[PDB]
Each structure stands twice: as structure tokens, then as C-alpha cells.
Amino acid sequence: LPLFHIALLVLFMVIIYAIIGLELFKGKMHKTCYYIGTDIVATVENEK
Amino acid sequence: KMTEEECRGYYYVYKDGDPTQMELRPRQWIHNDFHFDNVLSAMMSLFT
Amino acid sequence: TAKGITDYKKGFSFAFEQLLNYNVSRANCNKIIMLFTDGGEERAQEIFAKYNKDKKVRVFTFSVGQHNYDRGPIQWMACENKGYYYEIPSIGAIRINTQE
Amino acid sequence: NLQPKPIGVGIPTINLRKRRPNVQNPKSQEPVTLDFLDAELENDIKVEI
Amino acid sequence: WKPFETIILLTIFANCVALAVYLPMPEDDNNSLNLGLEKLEYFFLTVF
Amino acid sequence: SRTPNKIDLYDVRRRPWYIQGAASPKDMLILVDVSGSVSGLTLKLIRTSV
Amino acid sequence: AKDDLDPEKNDSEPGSQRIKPVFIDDANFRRQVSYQHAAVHIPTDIYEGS
Numbered sequence A: 001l002p003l004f005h006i007a008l009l010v011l012f013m014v015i016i017y018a019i020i021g022l023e024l025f026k027g028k029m030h031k032t033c034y035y036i037g038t039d040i041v042a043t044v045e046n047e048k
Numbered sequence B: 001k002m003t004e005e006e007c008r009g010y011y012y013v014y015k016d017g018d019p020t021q022m023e024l025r026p027r028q029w030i031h032n033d034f035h036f037d038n039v040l041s042a043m044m045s046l047f048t
Numbered sequence C: 001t002a003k004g005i006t007d008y009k010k011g012f013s014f015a016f017e018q019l020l021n022y023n024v025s026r027a028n029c030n031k032i033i034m035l036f037t038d039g040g041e042e043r044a045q046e047i048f049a050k051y052n053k054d055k056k057v058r059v060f061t062f063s064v065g066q067h068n069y070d071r072g073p074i075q076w077m078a079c080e081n082k083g084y085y086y087e088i089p090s091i092g093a094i095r096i097n098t099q100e
Numbered sequence D: 001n002l003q004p005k006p007i008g009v010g011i012p013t014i015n016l017r018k019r020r021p022n023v024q025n026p027k028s029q030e031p032v033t034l035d036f037l038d039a040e041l042e043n044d045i046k047v048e049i
Numbered sequence E: 001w002k003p004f005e006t007i008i009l010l011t012i013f014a015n016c017v018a019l020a021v022y023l024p025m026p027e028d029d030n031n032s033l034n035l036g037l038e039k040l041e042y043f044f045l046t047v048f
Numbered sequence F: 001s002r003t004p005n006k007i008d009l010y011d012v013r014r015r016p017w018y019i020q021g022a023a024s025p026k027d028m029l030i031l032v033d034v035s036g037s038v039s040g041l042t043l044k045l046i047r048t049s050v
Numbered sequence G: 001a002k003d004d005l006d007p008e009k010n011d012s013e014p015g016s017q018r019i020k021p022v023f024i025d026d027a028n029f030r031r032q033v034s035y036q037h038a039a040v041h042i043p044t045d046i047y048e049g050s
């Protein structure tokens, strides 16, 4: 009962930033480097 | 290879889990970066 | 595709019957059966008593992959039948145990 | 009729979309087992021979 | 009066041990103790 | 081994000439365990052993 | 066999000492060969010096 005005502030803050991110970063992370001619993603051994 | 004496020469890694696609690398006896080997390293491990 | 209950009794009945065809053209020399499996809770003592009471057949059991299933029964089967036991955890371990 | 090239099985299908450019798969080890009824045209008077 | 509360407190402790000894297995496979512990479920289900 | 970029994976034991004189001919019979527990990394390994 | 024959290499693993042979070219072998000794093939994942 004391920590509810906080939990409604956290919630609307996750709503604010989620929407901003959606506008700003929507559909932007869909290109990686591949091996030429192939469907094999190229990374270094410790790289994600 | 379970002892340092056997951990010599070369082994095969298999990229993308594929037993047709493998490369040759040297095997090496490696120590963990955080260990409990003396008391002072053990305090560094436990701080982490 | 893997699906369903493990049964080492219907697996070694089917194996022995296959081994006894004698109508087909055959090598008729070393008769051996090798099973690839991870862990076994049943030793199937009954199937080996009759099908190979005199141990004509040789049984090799292979435990593969990194897993926690019990390997004692499989080792026992190998020991009972004058076969051998081989683990394979890895792809680089396949080449020297399937020739050994 | 016997030739140096290995005896082949099936229609060869390799996927170009999944072969890395520098890993070197196994080439071949099979024996060259051509049969007499496959080196020459088969008869019934040759299966007797 | 007294022991009715201490027999169901050890009956529930046995149901909680029964849950914790169950071994989840992939792709509709089982062992023998998972078979006997689902026949032990009918006991706790008839006591409660 | 490493002076070109193709690397030999040739084993004498594996060789057919080595094998015929290693041992006598044989009627084998591979059993494969296909129960649910095997599915995963282990199932992948079996197809490559056989 | 399968080692660089270049004289200036000199790896010299412990336990072992190599040979630089002289390698005449030949017929009945369609490759250069030495008749003074036998080569040795060690497979690749096997360490030599064990």
C-alpha cells in the first residue's frame, strides 16, 4: 500500500520509453553480415 | 584431454555444430582468470 | 525423430531375430550387435539369457552426448556379452570410437 | 571398362547456401567396386559364366 | 484437537517431497519412479 | 597439415586395407535408441556415429 | 611426412629429430621419392611426442 504510486510511475515510464523506442528504432536491426552467397551469419569467435 | 601432458598438439572445432565444417587449432592448458589458488586470488574471486 | 518410451527388451528381441535369418545370404562370422543410447535403467537380463545363453553374439553399448542418465546398466550389458563400452560426448570423439 | 573415377551412387545434391568458403570437408574413401554384370551388358548366358 | 494438524502437516510435506523428486523428461518419455509417483498422487488426492 | 588450407584427416586404422587384416568379416546390426530422452544434442550425435 | 622440408624452419619438438631427405624424381611412382628411409604418417589430431 505505500509502494503503489511508485509502481504506477514505473509503469508509465516503461510505456513512455517503449513507444519512443518503437518510433525511433522500429525495424532497424534486420541486417547482419553474412557469408557471400550464403545464409550463414559471419562472426568472430567471441562476437555475438 | 584431462591432464596438461595430454593437452598438446591440435584438435578440431566444428563451426555451426556441423561435422563436415571444421578447423584446426592448437590445444592449450588454460587457467581460469578467477581462481582460488592462493588466498589473495581467492579474495579477488569472491569480490567478483 | 526421437519420440517415445525406451524399451530394451523389444530392442534386443528384434535384434536377435534379425541375427537368426539364415535364409538370406550372410557373412556368418562374427555376430555382433551395437546399441547407441544415452542412459539405461534396465539391464534386460532376461533377453540375454536365452537369445545368447552361450554368448555367441557380442554386444557393444555406446553412451553418447553429455547427459546425466545412468550408465551402469549399459556397462553391465557390455561386460556380460564380451563386447566393449565406448562413450562419445563430442563430434571429435566419434572418429576413434567407431573404429576401435 | 573399369575406370579411375570412383563408382558413384545417387544423383549428387550439394547445397551452395550452406557450404563455408574455407573449411575442407572429406573428399572420398570408397573402393571402386564395379561388378562384372555392370561393366558389360548383362545377359542370362553371362550370369551363368 | 492436536494431532490432526500434525498429520496433514506431514502429509503435505510428503506431497512436497513427491513433487521435488519427479524427473521431467523430454518428448513423452518416463522412468519407473515417475510412474510410481503418479500412483502416489491418488493417495494425497484422497486424503485431502 | 597447415602449409596449405586443406587439412588431411587420414587415419591408418580407418583404412580399408588395414581393416580387412585387422579382423574377420562380420554380420553386424546397429541398434539405435530413439526414445524421447535422446532428442537434443545426443540425437544429433547418434546419426553421425552410425 | 606432412612437415615443411625447408631447411631454415628447425622446429625440433622434444623427443624427436627430423630428417631432410634428398628426393629424386621417379617412375613407377609419379612423385619425388627417397630410397634411403621410410616416411612416417602421424594423423593430425594425434600428437607426436606422446
Ligand SMILES: COC(=O)C1=C(C)NC(C)=C([N+](=O)[O-])[C@H]1c1ccccc1C(F)(F)F
Binding pocket: B046, B047, B048
Ligand atoms: C572488505 O570487504 C570487501 O572486500 C567487499 C566485498 C568482497 N564485496 C564488495 C562489493 C564490497 N564493496 O567494495 O562494496 C566490500 C563490501 C561488501 C559488503 C559489505 C561491505 C563491504 C565493504 F568493503 F565496503 F565494507
